[PDB]
């Protein structure tokens, strides 16, 4: 009986314990991809300020053309 | 082991919405440059 109990325990603890490593690798790589998402957002910010500057410059240019 | 897969599915959905954000940014930028260059050409042409 004690031998059978020891066999049961060693088998059940050998089966107790690597695909989660690769899955968490995917998780972290996609976290990097969403840092790239934040990069896309800051690119949008840059395009927004560029649009503002372009509108200001073109409006002043039109004023100058009307002046001339 | 499966809860991390659930987080993976959530990040799948976030990747898809990131793709939609890419499309929106591209559309906005392209329309911006097109309208801007045409408008600037118009105001460099008319006053001459």
């Amino acid at each position: 009986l004690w031998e059978r109990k020891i066999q049961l325990e060693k088998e059940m603890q050998e089966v107790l314990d690597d695909v989660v490593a690769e899955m968490k690798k995917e998780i972290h790589r996609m976290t990097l991809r969403h840092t790239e998402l934040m990069r896309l957002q800051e690119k949008l910010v840059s395009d927004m300020e560029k649009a503002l500057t372009k509108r200001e410059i073109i409006s002043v240019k039109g004023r100058a053309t009307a002046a001339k | 082991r499966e809860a991390l897969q659930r987080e993976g599915d959530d990040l799948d959905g976030r990747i898809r919405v990131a793709e939609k954000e890419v499309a929106a940014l591209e559309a906005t930028l392209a329309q911006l440059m097109a309208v801007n260059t045409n408008f600037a050409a118009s105001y460099k042409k008319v006053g001459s």
Partner: peptide
């Protein structure tokens, strides 16, 4: 999107100032 509106509002303000000056 709303972020485009902030640029559009500034454009509207500048055009409104121009139109008021012309008035």
């Amino acid at each position: 999107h709303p972020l485009l509106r902030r640029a559009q509002e500034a454009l509207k303000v500048q055009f409104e100032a121009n139109r008021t000056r012309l008035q």
